[PDB]
Amino acid sequence: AKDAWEIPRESLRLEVKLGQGCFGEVWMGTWNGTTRVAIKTLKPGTMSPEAFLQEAQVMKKLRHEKLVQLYAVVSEEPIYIVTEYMSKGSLLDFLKGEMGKYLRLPQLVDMAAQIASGMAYVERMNYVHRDLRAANILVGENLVCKVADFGLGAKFPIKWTAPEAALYGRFTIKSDVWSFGILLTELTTKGRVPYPGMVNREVLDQVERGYRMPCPPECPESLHDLMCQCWRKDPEERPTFEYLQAFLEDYFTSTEPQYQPGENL
Numbered sequence: 163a164k165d166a167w168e169i170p171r172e173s174l175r176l177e178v179k180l181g182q183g184c185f186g187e188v189w190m191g192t193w194n195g196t197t198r199v200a201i202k203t204l205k206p207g208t209m210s211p212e213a214f215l216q217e218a219q220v221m222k223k224l225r226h227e228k229l230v231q232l233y234a235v236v237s238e239e240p241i242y243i244v245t246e247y248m249s250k251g252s253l254l255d256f257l258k259g260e261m262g263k264y265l266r267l268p269q270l271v272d273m274a275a276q277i278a279s280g281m282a283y284v285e286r287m288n289y290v291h292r293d294l295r296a297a298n299i300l301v302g303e304n305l306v307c308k309v310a311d312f313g314l315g316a317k318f319p320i321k322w323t324a325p326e327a328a329l330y331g332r333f334t335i336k337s338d339v340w341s342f343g344i345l346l347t348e349l350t351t352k353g354r355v356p357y358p359g360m361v362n363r364e365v366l367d368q369v370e371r372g373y374r375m376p377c378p379p380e381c382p383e384s385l386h387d388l389m390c391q392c393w394r395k396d397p398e399e400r401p402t403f404e405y406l407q408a409f410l411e412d413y414f415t416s417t418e419p420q421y422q423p424g425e426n427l
């Protein structure tokens with residue numbers, strides 16, 4: 163009964179409450195009085211410990227510079243899960259906030275490449291995300307982006323979920339690629355909700371019949387084409403994250419070498 167990830171309760175200090183749920187809370191804090199960190203709590207009773215510590219177990223095996231890193235854990239109720247802190251918050255909040263007005267296509271595509279890199283790691287390790295979207299991406303200094311999962315049948319983010327997954331429960335790394343496509347629209351519209359003006363029911367009927375969001379204003383058609391590849395009716399058709407990462411990293415030389423800054427992108 164000795165785990166290296168275990169830390170003493172006295173070493174943690176919850177300073178600012180960041181959110182709540184029926185299962186627990188999230189806070190910004192300090193570890194060992196030197197490291198700022200994010201802290202997730204388990205509300206006693208609501209959910210079973212082991213069902214909760216499952217996540218921490220997964221995070222113990224995953225390690226990549228573009229994936230939120232598990233720092234420590236307090237495995238005996240009340241349980242605490244500790245990770246690195248990301249100075250700029252969710253990508254979604256960053257995108258629509260004061261910073262959103264200054265971000266241009268070169269920055270937004272670099273952020274996508276990083277997310278793609280994080281997802282390419284998830285892909286190589288054979289895991290599935292199931293809720294990839296801007297609200298689950300964290301932003302740090304110098305625009306570093308990392309994939310996370312705030313755990314935000316039950317609530318279904320239909321607008322971000324591939325049809326085969328939202329209808330028939332088939333969640334795979336390919337349904338995540340579909341989500342990445344949607345994420346690219348959030349990036350190019352500065353965090354706007356996808357399928358504007360459409361409720362879940364119509365989004366389901368529409369995509370079902372082949373509908374796909376059009377090219378966002380000032381967004382090069384070549385990037386919209388990437389989105390469409392991500393939204394291919396057939397999972398296998400969809401590109402891999404390894405492909406997506408390389409395509410985005412090389413984007414301004416191989417695909418859009420004549421790129422010129424506009425008003426918003």
Ligand SMILES: Cc1ccc(NC(=O)c2ccc(CN3CCN(C)CC3)cc2)cc1Nc1nccc(-c2cccnc2)n1
Binds near residue numbers: 188246309311
């Ligand atoms: C405190 C904590 C506890 C757990 C996690 N967990 C994850 O981010 C995560 C990422 C990937 C997986 C992999 N998993 C594979 C299987 N499929 C089905 C689900 C995903 C699991 C958990 C993050 C955090 N960090 C966190 N949580 C909420 C908000 C913030 C935060 C807010 C503002 C600034 N900086 C950080 N930080």
